[PDB]
Ligand binder design. Structure first.
Ligand SMILES: [Ca+2]
Ligand SMILES: [Ca+2]
Ligand SMILES: [Ca+2]
Ligand SMILES: [Ca+2]
Lengths: 390, 382, 379
């Protein structure tokens, strides 16, 4: 009580405990995070959002498929070549680390990790269309791990559609063996035959509801010797505006502390790219269970040690702080993002406490307003400060 | 390797008209039926929970009495002709809606509907979006008949006397009836029908949120010897944009096959206007999971409803001349992806190198097969 | 003729029974109405809305805090100084009776009743962000009634954050602190907090408070007056898709039977008493007219589902306020009277078959009432 951690902290999603494997072989894997809403009523409004983590070895290819869900794809580490196959055309995009791209629901696509000696790590925000809680991947490919969805149609339908005998269709499309799974390893020669065509990093990508964007290609919103914060919002990008989601990429050096702060209205889903950190989230809980009886809220403390691939949810308005125990970088999706205001609770810049008039501070706290202000102005830095460990 | 097959009553996406419709009202002049809730039959249709489907049918020279509902309506005339009159607080507007024409009736709008034809029945399908309870709506009839009391009767005598500035005896005799019609659908004399056509606005030209529209009044998006597809999207109509819904009207001749395809993001609710057809919908099952392909099939007939979840491949074989209508939910920017033929075929956009590893045969042999069918959209079912 | 009244009327919320106390001391109280959706499926779409009532004595201050919910604040009685504290600025506004203002979710704010003698009464529509059904107030202050949320952080985090040893942090911020979240201030302190506040100006701002009565009433006669502001006239209202109504009625006046086409209405009695009659349908699908009646008094809340006919008889001079949810293009259809009467727009031939009497007779009855919207109804 008063201090929840582990399974007692519903906002912490340990990567080795809360991810479900959709597919996995020796060339990579796809895992989906368990539902947010099933763990806490305080995440009920994240019910139509799922998080997917993808990782593949060098020279790999995720076979063509589409899903009944909108995807906001982000490359955490490595390089990827995303190809959107449309009914009458196709577009390839080279997505370097930090780049993101929206993939409308039902868009057939495939992507490759063109790197010869580096893995590819991607995180995707998924918004299911048919059932708000779950989506399904439809693979067109026919492998030992799955049958092409085309096999879903009867012989008569297939023959008339392809204008050929089923024996042939079956031999060519369903089965000259076939691949093991949806993730296959290609040779350098196979890559260039279509990769060298893809579109590399664009200029000011944040201007097309179809072109990928790099939130790192912008002036950090916060930046000092302890950390830097890059962020792209609905106000800055079309794809983001449609999803009403903002994206953040935060770098923090060992021993840095991201000061206590809260987002006014955005619900934040963060993922550790690399590094380790200690996080503290502050919530409230009513100890009075008799509805028609006076409420009685007590401060609740939710903590966790975050590591690579871990996911943590910061409900809107909940104060939070992060102490980087090693060089760190985390990414975050801000849901209900439009006009979000990040309120810091210490330091110089963006400190909402410093905007409170002296007289109000005086009655709000034990000490005089003068003394409260003296304490407030003690910290010389803003946003990120020295965690002063040991 | 034979995929699992679910047919007829085992197919949650198929709604046989004689099994899944609940009668809201019926008499010798017509009937109103509401379809069973989508979300209750499958979690894969959970996002259709805010949508109800209503089928209305009435005999020649009939009138559906004035009423309003706590639901937005997208009314479509499948067969026959209708005169829809929207009564507002300060005015009224009558519109002639011929077969294929549609019109949105904002929630709470008092209205009445007439089948002005002397011989043809009127068949209508309506998409309903409830306001108070997301799952259901209620019709508030202002009329007083043997089948129902006016909602005005819900007020007390004193309130009514003060409101109408009349003794209750007069209010009662005039509006409640302490002779009244049998039900909410009545037969009018041919002479009365004409007495209500003088202000009926006939079909016009091309984009108002008030007046009705005709989706079949544009070049079909797909058209050939085997069939044609008419479609109006939210991008082409404000009423449709407000609802984020598109409407389709498809004609297919006997023996025609609507090629395997899927809608990228739209959830489709189709209804058979006339004719018969076989349909196959492809879904999937549930390391942790090995998504297996399932075939949801059914024999479709008049008035039947079938739901095609977004992104699920589907194909239709018309066994007799056929026409069906469809409502596309979550319509904005929907992309129809065909899986065969020489037009809109997403498979023909996949580079050979990818095909090479995506299927057993070589990329060369896959392309060969893909180009075999030179026809597009609709082909001979052979 | 089944009538569901008082305690059995799910749409009626007696203020003396359905409000839960969130905070209360000798200086004021904050109460939240129980959830609408748990009372009836007919109010299921009101599940993302909560109603809060606030009352405080003269010269009082509601301490700095924020909530994970959008608030649409309305001053029913008195005057308030609302100060919104942002990350890098603050804005203070004077809100007189009848004025309203939206407080975006998570905005830290404090509220003062600057009057030296009068109390302050406010009602707020709340739209929760994390749990659609409930929100929580995060008080930054440290009082006997609640500790600052800053105390939720570990000593090491607070020490590094403020660059001070915990001893001093604790004595300054946590620890003589006030008893509760509503405190009485000295007249001198109150004056300092109101002198720089922006007074009520003229005419449509994204942040500025607005007065729904600073416009011509949409309905007005000897017996009643109705002011209304729609999303089509104010950006804050447009963002919420909510309209706000404020109507005055003389004792004995009757607001004629009518219905809102698509808006779900949540009304709150400001002052006075009235008898309300709501008409529903208790459910082929043989529907039956259901009568929902109630005697309303100050602070009571009553919900009128969209499209449901309703009538209100004032039994004393009365004023009520109302929030209209799903407001865009709502059309209020009256069922009697000389204006906005939907019945008067139905053709004779249709009336002829819709009712027992002849069309001309029905029409005769319809035009009997010369008054519009409000009429005198005294027994
Ligand atoms: Ca003090
Ligand atoms: Ca006729
Ligand atoms: Ca092959
Ligand atoms: Ca009659």
């Amino acid at each position: 009580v008063s201090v929840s951690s582990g399974k007692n902290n519903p906002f912490y999603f340990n990567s080795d405990r809360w991810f479900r494997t959709l597919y996995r072989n020796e060339w990579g894997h796809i895992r989906v995070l368990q539902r947010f809403d099933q763990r806490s009523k305080q995440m009920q409004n994240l019910e139509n959002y799922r998080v997917v983590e993808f990782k593949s070895k060098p020279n790999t290819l995720l076979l063509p498929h589409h899903a009944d869900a909108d995807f906001l794809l982000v490359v955490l580490n490595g390089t990827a070549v995303l190809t959107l196959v449309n009914p009458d055309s196709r577009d390839s995009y080279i997505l370097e680390q930090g780049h993101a791209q929206k993939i409308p629901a039902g868009t057939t696509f495939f992507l490759v990790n063109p790197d010869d000696n580096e893995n590819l790590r991607i995180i995707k925000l998924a918004i299911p269309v048919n059932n708000p809680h779950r989506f399904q991947d439809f693979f067109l490919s026919s492998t030992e791990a799955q049958q092409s969805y085309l096999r879903g149609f009867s012989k008569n339908i297939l023959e008339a559609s392809f204008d050929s005998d089923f024996k042939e269709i079956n031999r060519v499309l369903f089965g000259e063996s076939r691949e093991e799974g949806v993730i296959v390893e290609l040779k350098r020669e196979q890559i260039q035959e279509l990769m060298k065509h893809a579109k590399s990093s664009s200029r000011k990508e944040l201007s097309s509801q179809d072109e990928p964007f790099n939130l790192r290609n912008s002036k950090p919103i916060y930046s000092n010797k302890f950390g830097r914060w890059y962020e792209m919002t609905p106000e800055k990008n079309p794809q983001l505006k449609d999803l009403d989601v903002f994206i953040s990429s935060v770098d923090m050096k060992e021993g840095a502390l991201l000061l206590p702060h809260y987002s006014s209205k955005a619900i934040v889903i963060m993922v550790i790219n690399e590094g380790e950190a200690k996080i503290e989230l502050v919530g409230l809980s009513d100890q009075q269970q008799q509805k028609q009886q006076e409420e009685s809220l007590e401060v609740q403390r939710y903590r966790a040690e975050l590591s690579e691939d871990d996911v943590f949810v910061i409900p809107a308005a909940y104060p939070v702080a992060i102490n980087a125990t090693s060089n760190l970088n985390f990414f975050a999706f801000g849901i209900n993002a439009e006009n979000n205001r990040r309120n810091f609770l210490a330091g110089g810049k963006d400190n909402v406490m410093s905007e409170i008039p002296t007289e109000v501070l005086e009655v709000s706290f034990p000490a005089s307003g003068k003394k409260v202000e003296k304490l407030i102005k003690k910290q010389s830095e803003s946003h990120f400060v020295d965690a002063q460990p040991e």
